[PDB]
Amino acid sequence: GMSQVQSGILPEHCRAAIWIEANLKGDVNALREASKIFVDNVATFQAKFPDAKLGAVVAFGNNVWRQLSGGEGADELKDFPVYGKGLAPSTQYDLLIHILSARHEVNFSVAQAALAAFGDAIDVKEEIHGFRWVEERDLSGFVDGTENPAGEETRREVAVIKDGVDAGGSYVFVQRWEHNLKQLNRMSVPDQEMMIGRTKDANEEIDGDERPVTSHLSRVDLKEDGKGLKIVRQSLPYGTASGTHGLYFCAYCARLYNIEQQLLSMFGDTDGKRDAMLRFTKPVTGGYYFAPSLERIQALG
């Protein structure tokens, strides 16, 4: 009499991932059977590749989740709005599929199974292949993940809903960034460090009263009466060396509120100041999704 989390939320240190974002082309009923088939396929792939430490998540946009749930639960869910009056684009789609493991080849086979399950019921808008770079650094050269929640216990506390109809579920936020590494390389290392709020090589936090309020850490390390607004990030670098490249941002939270407060801060809506990382990288997509618990995917029908 309890709820099970979808396998792709809590895995830490996974080296590769695949994110598929898509729109629903026909009746929403096609998603019910397809989602059951896909979670069945994920269990089959986990049994076939135990050393991959494979996990996956199927999550839904506001319009299709309100239809599938009958308007019950997911009280915070809404279409991703535009932040900073345009600085952050909105590209809200209906379905998000997040696959992560220690083996990219296994993720590829799982992605093909997801596409076969949903079939022509969906219109794929985006497919991004994430990879962990050297020393878990973002392509800018700064380590990404240091203050991210560590261990299954704290990650569950931050990302997984505790009780009620949505017990075992989570809110998802995805946003693809395009880095301009030529513009980053024009900045001196000390100026890049003041932009992030941590040192580049050693990955040491620069004190809050020593760094600009526009620094990344000053924008996203938010507290409400001393209580941190934490999120579980699963972001990874992506792209080609000669073409488009950057960071595919992905975060899970039991409360959509924590993610929104950080976006309001980063894009100038809270105090009129914006994130200093906008000097070299920009967001080009944006969407909010609800990841139900495993058994609520089984009760779709």
Ligand code: HEM
């Ligand atoms: C280009 C896009 C982004 C890059 C390169 C990036 C990079 C980084 C880096 C280098 C860190 C510091 C190390 C760490 O603790 O993980 C960091 C921390 C963090 N980032 Fe970002 N980030 C990006 C976007 C975002 C977005 C969109 C959000 C949230 C909406 C976010 C939320 C956070 C949070 C919560 C932390 C930890 C802050 C703390 O408590 O110290 N980031 N990120």
Ligand SMILES: [Mg+2]
């Ligand atoms: Mg802190």
